Amino acid sequence: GPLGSKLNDILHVYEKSKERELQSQLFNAWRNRFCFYTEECNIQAISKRNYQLEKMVLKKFRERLLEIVKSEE
Amino acid sequence: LNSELLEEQKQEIYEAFSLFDMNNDGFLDYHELKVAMKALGFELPKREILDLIDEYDSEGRHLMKYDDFYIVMGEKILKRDPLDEIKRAFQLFDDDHTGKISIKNLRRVAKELGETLTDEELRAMIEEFDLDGDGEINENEFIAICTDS
Amino acid sequence: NSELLEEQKQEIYEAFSLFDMNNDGFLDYHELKVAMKALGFELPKREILDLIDEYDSEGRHLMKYDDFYIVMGEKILKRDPLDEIKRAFQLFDDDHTGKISIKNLRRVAKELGETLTDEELRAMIEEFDLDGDGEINENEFIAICTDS
């Protein structure tokens, strides 16, 4: 009555729940890609950086160990 | 390719029809059908609905059989451009109709979904996808969030 | 270009590969950000977006590997070697004692698959530890990592 025909009311309730599930889904997708790039990938990126920097230092160790051995004969 | 209806899609058709079969007889009349199509996103002018009914009717009644509904809605669903849904969603984020999703917009969405996110979390969510730098998310930016390329 | 170490060439290649989700030729803004992060570079958003534009002579708003190599090349060569030593020092000094302990060293080796023997580590402390604490502080670490 004050909210339309029974038929038209059924429609309203339906559209609302759909609008809600649309906002929920896409908000979730948004939030997922946000965590992908700022959490998952960030940790991968920091790991690669830190790993290569450590590699660099151990290559240095190797080189010096030689120099020490070469340091006597 | 997508030559067939997925399960969510067949489900959508069934549910929509079920909502408006008021005498529960596996048939919709013109008034019932008009709103059933609105529900699916397929609004048609009076005479086009009627033309559709006449096209699938063997015995002169302004009724539509579920099996027929299923076919007709089915091909309409397959032709659905997924972008329309993204753009429609953008409207629903943009309460105040500014063409942009601001932090106040997004906070409202989160709260409505029952999520509990600090304003910093909300600010950071925009920051990562705000390309032009104005601190809000425009339509093209939103589309980019909901895509793979 | 042709003045980078082999390690560095490999380093640039790996970072890019890590965040190439389509395995196509390029990265977008988000993949680029973390790619550079992997090489130790952290630019402001505007900078990264400006950087894409300069080399996107195509209009796709993606960044080509060819271009990534050239620009990261120059940045890597412009790395201050001493900051790298210092950043690396912090990575070794897990527990922040200000000295690289024998266990600090043995830990990293595990992580990298590497193994270094007791003899190697004493020959290392003997040569470079000048305090007498049997450990390596930052200055001692610099002497190790710099060519002399």
Side-chain angles (χ1 to χ4, degrees), chain C residues 63-80:
Chain C
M63 215 213 183
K64 200 190 187 197
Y65 180 72
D66 286 354
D67 294 333
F68 183 83
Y69 189 92
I70 299 159
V71 60
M72 300 303 93
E74 283 150 343
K75 280 182 192 281
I76 283 192
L77 282 162
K78 279 165 190 182
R79 279 173 177 162
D80 176 47

PDB file of all heavy atoms in Angstrom, chain C residues 63-80:
ATOM      1  N   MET C  63      54.898  -0.661 -17.859  1.00  0.00           N
ATOM      2  CA  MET C  63      56.329  -0.451 -18.086  1.00  0.00           C
ATOM      3  C   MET C  63      57.060  -1.676 -18.625  1.00  0.00           C
ATOM      4  O   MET C  63      57.057  -2.739 -18.002  1.00  0.00           O
ATOM      5  CB  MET C  63      57.039   0.082 -16.848  1.00  0.00           C
ATOM      6  CG  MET C  63      58.151   1.038 -17.231  1.00  0.00           C
ATOM      7  SD  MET C  63      59.714   1.046 -16.065  1.00  0.00           S
ATOM      8  CE  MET C  63      60.695   2.497 -16.992  1.00  0.00           C
ATOM      9  N   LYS C  64      57.704  -1.486 -19.773  1.00  0.00           N
ATOM     10  CA  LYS C  64      58.414  -2.540 -20.491  1.00  0.00           C
ATOM     11  C   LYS C  64      59.670  -3.000 -19.744  1.00  0.00           C
ATOM     12  O   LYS C  64      60.343  -2.200 -19.088  1.00  0.00           O
ATOM     13  CB  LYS C  64      58.790  -2.027 -21.882  1.00  0.00           C
ATOM     14  CG  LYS C  64      59.090  -3.108 -22.905  1.00  0.00           C
ATOM     15  CD  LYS C  64      59.692  -2.511 -24.163  1.00  0.00           C
ATOM     16  CE  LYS C  64      59.845  -3.561 -25.243  1.00  0.00           C
ATOM     17  NZ  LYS C  64      60.791  -3.113 -26.300  1.00  0.00           N
ATOM     18  N   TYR C  65      59.982  -4.288 -19.848  1.00  0.00           N
ATOM     19  CA  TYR C  65      61.188  -4.835 -19.235  1.00  0.00           C
ATOM     20  C   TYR C  65      62.448  -4.129 -19.728  1.00  0.00           C
ATOM     21  O   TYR C  65      63.297  -3.745 -18.926  1.00  0.00           O
ATOM     22  CB  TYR C  65      61.303  -6.341 -19.484  1.00  0.00           C
ATOM     23  CG  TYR C  65      62.541  -6.947 -18.866  1.00  0.00           C
ATOM     24  CD1 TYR C  65      62.639  -7.102 -17.485  1.00  0.00           C
ATOM     25  CD2 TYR C  65      63.620  -7.351 -19.655  1.00  0.00           C
ATOM     26  CE1 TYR C  65      63.770  -7.647 -16.899  1.00  0.00           C
ATOM     27  CE2 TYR C  65      64.762  -7.900 -19.079  1.00  0.00           C
ATOM     28  CZ  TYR C  65      64.827  -8.040 -17.696  1.00  0.00           C
ATOM     29  OH  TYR C  65      65.938  -8.576 -17.090  1.00  0.00           O
ATOM     30  N   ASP C  66      62.559  -3.977 -21.049  1.00  0.00           N
ATOM     31  CA  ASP C  66      63.661  -3.260 -21.689  1.00  0.00           C
ATOM     32  C   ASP C  66      63.932  -1.927 -21.008  1.00  0.00           C
ATOM     33  O   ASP C  66      65.079  -1.590 -20.711  1.00  0.00           O
ATOM     34  CB  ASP C  66      63.354  -3.020 -23.173  1.00  0.00           C
ATOM     35  CG  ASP C  66      63.488  -4.277 -24.019  1.00  0.00           C
ATOM     36  OD1 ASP C  66      63.929  -5.324 -23.497  1.00  0.00           O
ATOM     37  OD2 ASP C  66      63.154  -4.211 -25.222  1.00  0.00           O
ATOM     38  N   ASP C  67      62.861  -1.178 -20.756  1.00  0.00           N
ATOM     39  CA  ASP C  67      62.960   0.120 -20.106  1.00  0.00           C
ATOM     40  C   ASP C  67      63.277  -0.011 -18.621  1.00  0.00           C
ATOM     41  O   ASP C  67      64.055   0.774 -18.082  1.00  0.00           O
ATOM     42  CB  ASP C  67      61.673   0.921 -20.315  1.00  0.00           C
ATOM     43  CG  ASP C  67      61.442   1.289 -21.770  1.00  0.00           C
ATOM     44  OD1 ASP C  67      62.429   1.402 -22.534  1.00  0.00           O
ATOM     45  OD2 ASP C  67      60.264   1.471 -22.147  1.00  0.00           O
ATOM     46  N   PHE C  68      62.675  -1.007 -17.975  1.00  0.00           N
ATOM     47  CA  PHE C  68      62.929  -1.302 -16.566  1.00  0.00           C
ATOM     48  C   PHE C  68      64.416  -1.539 -16.333  1.00  0.00           C
ATOM     49  O   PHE C  68      64.991  -1.003 -15.393  1.00  0.00           O
ATOM     50  CB  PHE C  68      62.118  -2.526 -16.139  1.00  0.00           C
ATOM     51  CG  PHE C  68      62.239  -2.878 -14.676  1.00  0.00           C
ATOM     52  CD1 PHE C  68      61.459  -2.237 -13.721  1.00  0.00           C
ATOM     53  CD2 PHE C  68      63.100  -3.887 -14.258  1.00  0.00           C
ATOM     54  CE1 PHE C  68      61.556  -2.580 -12.371  1.00  0.00           C
ATOM     55  CE2 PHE C  68      63.196  -4.233 -12.911  1.00  0.00           C
ATOM     56  CZ  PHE C  68      62.422  -3.577 -11.970  1.00  0.00           C
ATOM     57  N   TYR C  69      65.030  -2.324 -17.214  1.00  0.00           N
ATOM     58  CA  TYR C  69      66.446  -2.670 -17.127  1.00  0.00           C
ATOM     59  C   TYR C  69      67.338  -1.435 -17.168  1.00  0.00           C
ATOM     60  O   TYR C  69      68.243  -1.295 -16.348  1.00  0.00           O
ATOM     61  CB  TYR C  69      66.812  -3.637 -18.260  1.00  0.00           C
ATOM     62  CG  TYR C  69      68.198  -4.240 -18.177  1.00  0.00           C
ATOM     63  CD1 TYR C  69      68.412  -5.464 -17.540  1.00  0.00           C
ATOM     64  CD2 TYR C  69      69.293  -3.602 -18.756  1.00  0.00           C
ATOM     65  CE1 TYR C  69      69.687  -6.030 -17.470  1.00  0.00           C
ATOM     66  CE2 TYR C  69      70.568  -4.156 -18.691  1.00  0.00           C
ATOM     67  CZ  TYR C  69      70.756  -5.368 -18.048  1.00  0.00           C
ATOM     68  OH  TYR C  69      72.019  -5.913 -17.988  1.00  0.00           O
ATOM     69  N   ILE C  70      67.072  -0.542 -18.117  1.00  0.00           N
ATOM     70  CA  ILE C  70      67.902   0.645 -18.324  1.00  0.00           C
ATOM     71  C   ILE C  70      67.859   1.569 -17.109  1.00  0.00           C
ATOM     72  O   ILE C  70      68.905   1.992 -16.613  1.00  0.00           O
ATOM     73  CB  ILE C  70      67.510   1.412 -19.617  1.00  0.00           C
ATOM     74  CG1 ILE C  70      67.700   0.514 -20.848  1.00  0.00           C
ATOM     75  CG2 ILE C  70      68.338   2.689 -19.767  1.00  0.00           C
ATOM     76  CD1 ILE C  70      66.901   0.932 -22.078  1.00  0.00           C
ATOM     77  N   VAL C  71      66.651   1.850 -16.623  1.00  0.00           N
ATOM     78  CA  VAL C  71      66.449   2.808 -15.531  1.00  0.00           C
ATOM     79  C   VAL C  71      66.883   2.267 -14.158  1.00  0.00           C
ATOM     80  O   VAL C  71      67.432   3.017 -13.343  1.00  0.00           O
ATOM     81  CB  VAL C  71      64.993   3.383 -15.517  1.00  0.00           C
ATOM     82  CG1 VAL C  71      63.966   2.288 -15.340  1.00  0.00           C
ATOM     83  CG2 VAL C  71      64.826   4.458 -14.451  1.00  0.00           C
ATOM     84  N   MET C  72      66.653   0.975 -13.912  1.00  0.00           N
ATOM     85  CA  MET C  72      67.132   0.327 -12.681  1.00  0.00           C
ATOM     86  C   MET C  72      68.642   0.164 -12.719  1.00  0.00           C
ATOM     87  O   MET C  72      69.314   0.301 -11.699  1.00  0.00           O
ATOM     88  CB  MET C  72      66.471  -1.035 -12.454  1.00  0.00           C
ATOM     89  CG  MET C  72      64.947  -1.005 -12.310  1.00  0.00           C
ATOM     90  SD  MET C  72      64.219   0.153 -10.880  1.00  0.00           S
ATOM     91  CE  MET C  72      63.920   1.832 -11.908  1.00  0.00           C
ATOM     92  N   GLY C  73      69.161  -0.133 -13.907  1.00  0.00           N
ATOM     93  CA  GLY C  73      70.591  -0.174 -14.129  1.00  0.00           C
ATOM     94  C   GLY C  73      71.226   1.060 -13.535  1.00  0.00           C
ATOM     95  O   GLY C  73      72.011   0.962 -12.595  1.00  0.00           O
ATOM     96  N   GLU C  74      70.843   2.224 -14.057  1.00  0.00           N
ATOM     97  CA  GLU C  74      71.423   3.503 -13.642  1.00  0.00           C
ATOM     98  C   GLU C  74      71.256   3.776 -12.156  1.00  0.00           C
ATOM     99  O   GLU C  74      72.160   4.312 -11.519  1.00  0.00           O
ATOM    100  CB  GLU C  74      70.847   4.661 -14.458  1.00  0.00           C
ATOM    101  CG  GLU C  74      71.431   4.776 -15.858  1.00  0.00           C
ATOM    102  CD  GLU C  74      70.448   5.362 -16.863  1.00  0.00           C
ATOM    103  OE1 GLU C  74      69.225   5.378 -16.584  1.00  0.00           O
ATOM    104  OE2 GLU C  74      70.899   5.803 -17.944  1.00  0.00           O
ATOM    105  N   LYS C  75      70.106   3.407 -11.605  1.00  0.00           N
ATOM    106  CA  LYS C  75      69.874   3.582 -10.181  1.00  0.00           C
ATOM    107  C   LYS C  75      70.815   2.701  -9.363  1.00  0.00           C
ATOM    108  O   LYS C  75      71.411   3.172  -8.391  1.00  0.00           O
ATOM    109  CB  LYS C  75      68.418   3.298  -9.823  1.00  0.00           C
ATOM    110  CG  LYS C  75      67.464   4.435 -10.116  1.00  0.00           C
ATOM    111  CD  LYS C  75      66.066   4.054  -9.668  1.00  0.00           C
ATOM    112  CE  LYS C  75      65.028   5.018 -10.189  1.00  0.00           C
ATOM    113  NZ  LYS C  75      64.982   6.263  -9.387  1.00  0.00           N
ATOM    114  N   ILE C  76      70.959   1.437  -9.775  1.00  0.00           N
ATOM    115  CA  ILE C  76      71.813   0.478  -9.065  1.00  0.00           C
ATOM    116  C   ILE C  76      73.251   0.957  -9.045  1.00  0.00           C
ATOM    117  O   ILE C  76      73.909   0.910  -8.008  1.00  0.00           O
ATOM    118  CB  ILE C  76      71.749  -0.957  -9.649  1.00  0.00           C
ATOM    119  CG1 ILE C  76      70.460  -1.660  -9.223  1.00  0.00           C
ATOM    120  CG2 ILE C  76      72.909  -1.783  -9.144  1.00  0.00           C
ATOM    121  CD1 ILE C  76      70.436  -3.158  -9.502  1.00  0.00           C
ATOM    122  N   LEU C  77      73.731   1.423 -10.194  1.00  0.00           N
ATOM    123  CA  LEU C  77      75.095   1.934 -10.304  1.00  0.00           C
ATOM    124  C   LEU C  77      75.288   3.171  -9.442  1.00  0.00           C
ATOM    125  O   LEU C  77      76.404   3.476  -9.033  1.00  0.00           O
ATOM    126  CB  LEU C  77      75.456   2.225 -11.761  1.00  0.00           C
ATOM    127  CG  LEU C  77      75.805   1.015 -12.633  1.00  0.00           C
ATOM    128  CD1 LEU C  77      75.708   1.377 -14.106  1.00  0.00           C
ATOM    129  CD2 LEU C  77      77.187   0.436 -12.295  1.00  0.00           C
ATOM    130  N   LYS C  78      74.191   3.866  -9.156  1.00  0.00           N
ATOM    131  CA  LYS C  78      74.237   5.068  -8.337  1.00  0.00           C
ATOM    132  C   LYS C  78      74.042   4.789  -6.846  1.00  0.00           C
ATOM    133  O   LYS C  78      74.143   5.704  -6.030  1.00  0.00           O
ATOM    134  CB  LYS C  78      73.255   6.125  -8.863  1.00  0.00           C
ATOM    135  CG  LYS C  78      73.820   6.903 -10.053  1.00  0.00           C
ATOM    136  CD  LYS C  78      72.769   7.689 -10.820  1.00  0.00           C
ATOM    137  CE  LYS C  78      73.366   8.226 -12.115  1.00  0.00           C
ATOM    138  NZ  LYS C  78      72.396   9.050 -12.878  1.00  0.00           N
ATOM    139  N   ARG C  79      73.782   3.527  -6.496  1.00  0.00           N
ATOM    140  CA  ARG C  79      73.753   3.087  -5.098  1.00  0.00           C
ATOM    141  C   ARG C  79      75.065   3.453  -4.435  1.00  0.00           C
ATOM    142  O   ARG C  79      76.136   3.189  -4.989  1.00  0.00           O
ATOM    143  CB  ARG C  79      73.612   1.564  -5.003  1.00  0.00           C
ATOM    144  CG  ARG C  79      72.218   0.973  -5.151  1.00  0.00           C
ATOM    145  CD  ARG C  79      72.336  -0.548  -5.186  1.00  0.00           C
ATOM    146  NE  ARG C  79      71.047  -1.234  -5.258  1.00  0.00           N
ATOM    147  CZ  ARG C  79      70.898  -2.504  -5.634  1.00  0.00           C
ATOM    148  NH1 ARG C  79      71.961  -3.222  -5.979  1.00  0.00           N
ATOM    149  NH2 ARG C  79      69.692  -3.059  -5.678  1.00  0.00           N
ATOM    150  N   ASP C  80      74.992   4.057  -3.254  1.00  0.00           N
ATOM    151  CA  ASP C  80      76.192   4.285  -2.465  1.00  0.00           C
ATOM    152  C   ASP C  80      76.584   2.945  -1.856  1.00  0.00           C
ATOM    153  O   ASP C  80      75.802   2.361  -1.104  1.00  0.00           O
ATOM    154  CB  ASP C  80      75.957   5.332  -1.372  1.00  0.00           C
ATOM    155  CG  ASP C  80      77.164   5.513  -0.465  1.00  0.00           C
ATOM    156  OD1 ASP C  80      78.297   5.650  -0.976  1.00  0.00           O
ATOM    157  OD2 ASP C  80      76.978   5.523   0.767  1.00  0.00           O
TER     158      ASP C  80
END
